[PDB]
Amino acid sequence: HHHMKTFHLTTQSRDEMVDITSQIETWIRETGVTNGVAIVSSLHTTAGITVNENADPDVKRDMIMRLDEVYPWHHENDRHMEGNTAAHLKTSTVGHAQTLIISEGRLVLGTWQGVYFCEFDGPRTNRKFVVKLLTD
Amino acid sequence: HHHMKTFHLTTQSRDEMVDITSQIETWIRETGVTNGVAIVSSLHTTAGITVNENADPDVKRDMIMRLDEVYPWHHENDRHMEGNTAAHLKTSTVGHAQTLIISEGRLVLGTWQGVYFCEFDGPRTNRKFVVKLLTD
Amino acid sequence: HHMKTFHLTTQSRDEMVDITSQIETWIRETGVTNGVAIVSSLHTTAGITVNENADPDVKRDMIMRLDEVYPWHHENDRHMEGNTAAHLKTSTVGHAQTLIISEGRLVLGTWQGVYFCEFDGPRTNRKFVVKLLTD
């Protein structure tokens, strides 16, 4: 498996930030990797990956709200037939992937940092992200 | 071998998203790397790298259009007299670099993911990105 | 395992601090020649970016534009602490950046420097980490 695993999620609304930290960690533990990096990569162009505050759900609510204002869903100048241009912008804005450091078997994250799958075009039943580990 | 290759682009307009997936894949094949990661990095402060929809050109058109509204070219509060502040914002917003996973001698990309060089201050004759592979 | 923590004290709400030289000094001390460096903020309100390292007006303008895109005060914010805008700016530039190391130097274009982006200062003992992976 080359320390690579695909994870599956079902999302429940257009916009959703799903904390995936524990899934990543549990799987690092399973592989036995102690030091290196983890690449966490959405397989989608309308859902991304970010790191942000892990405790107050109002942070992620406010992130979703602000991004909805920065990139409104409807725009008169949009040409992309599918209608989900805003989700493509949001995905490129937070990133499709994040690179995390692994030290002594743990993700190197501050106390309040968690890893989120950022759904911008839900609800969808088939969402996926990949985690790939590289060891020192 | 260092598994690092630099690529040259000439861009033809202020804003341009150029699909560079083939350059990256071709270099992976040439190096014989089967599993690991690829770091794709712009050498510029006014062009970045992103992963987004790789089939409908209207996605790229709309991305450029939306970014132009988020970061208008002319802004009364700008101090940077060269006049390309907006390009600097766009570059930091999409990122100067992306990290991709390599599995079975190919990039791990979802169905519609491609890698784009995002020119925000063209046309320019000597744009560069670097592809660095790391092996398992 | 070539990982080091660095502390910074920031001096205003918004500050872009050039950390390039600090990263490069670590690399030189470890003797790592080729690989990658992962530069990662430990904070949800400060990020890491790569941008223009010569003209201070670029980073002034970056801070200004970000403050317009994500205004500090917003009637619809529910996060009562008041620093929502810092969270958005952090996710927008990124909490971390990956840099290539070649011949003991960061692979950076002429005007490219690495910045710690404070969006909720001034604070003491802001931190980032640098992890090196060698070929």
Ligand code: NA
């Ligand atoms: Na970003």
